[PDB]
């Protein structure tokens, strides 16, 4: 008979196919809270991150829509709609704060103390950077500073390991550079250090591809397109 861990992993993949990512999250958390000294397999670790990226991702999209609407109704001085919109937004933000705190507790409690290779250390620290950065995207004032500070500590810990342990062409490292640069551009409003970081990750990858090739080419070339996309539209905005 299969173990609970096997059946939770199987349910999670059923949850992903039915597109019920909340329950996908719950199943993958049962797997994580059942760990001893060992760490998640690449597969389970990617199932956890896909679950959470899709739960948070639906709220982020909702937040963005409700924010743009509120910015329009502010533009007309239509306060009653504005107050309704903001109660709605505040509710979406309460979910964002809960989803983030779920994964962020897991990461510090189970996942990061189990990481045993460079691959997973970077993977979990970058995911800690990511979810502190989703908080930053909507927090204001004192709360925003704390998020941004947490984000920067996590991404820099990730990158100290990534640049010393993974190849320039590794998708988790390229993904880290991609997000770290986005954090400089959109949270810290620093286009100078966004481009320096993004373009340096791209150039070290190109250099490795030109001399050594790489394995898992599929994933990296697309993140590399992402890097180049953000770069060419960041640098058109500095000029334009």
């Amino acid at each position: 008979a299969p173990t609970a861990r096997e059946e939770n992993v199987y349910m999670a993949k059923l949850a992903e196919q039915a597109e019920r990512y909340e329950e996908m999250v719950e199943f993958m958390e049962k797997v994580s809270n059942s760990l001893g000294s060992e760490e998640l397999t690449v597969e389970e670790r990617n199932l956890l991150s896909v679950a959470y990226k899709n739960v948070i991702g639906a709220r982020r999209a909702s937040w963005r829509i409700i924010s743009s609407i509120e910015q329009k109704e502010e533009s007309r001085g239509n306060e009653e709609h504005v107050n309704s919109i903001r109660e709605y937004r505040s509710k979406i933000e309460n979910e964002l704060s809960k989803i983030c705190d779920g994964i962020l507790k897991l990461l510090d409690a189970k996942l990061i103390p189990s990481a045993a290779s460079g691959d997973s250390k970077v993977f979990y620290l970058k995911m800690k950077g990511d979810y502190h950065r989703y908080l930053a995207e909507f927090k204001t004032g004192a709360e925003r500073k704390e998020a941004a500070e947490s984000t920067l500590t996590a991404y820099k810990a990730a990158q100290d390991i990534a640049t010393t342990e993974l190849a320039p062409t590794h998708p988790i490292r390229l993904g880290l550079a991609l997000n770290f640069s986005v954090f400089y551009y959109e949270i810290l409003n620093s286009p100078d250090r966004a481009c320096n970081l993004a373009k340096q990750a791209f150039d070290e990858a190109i250099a490795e591809l030109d001399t050594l090739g790489e394995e898992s080419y599929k994933d990296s070339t697309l993140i590399m397109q992402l890097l180049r996309d953000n770069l060419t539209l960041w640098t058109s905005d500095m000029q334009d």
């Binding site: 390229l174 993904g175 880290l176 991609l178 997000n179 986005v182 959109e186 993140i223 992402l226 953000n230």
Partner: peptide
């Protein structure tokens, strides 16, 4: 809103 991994 920019591209992120």
């Amino acid at each position: 809103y920019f591209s992120s991994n």
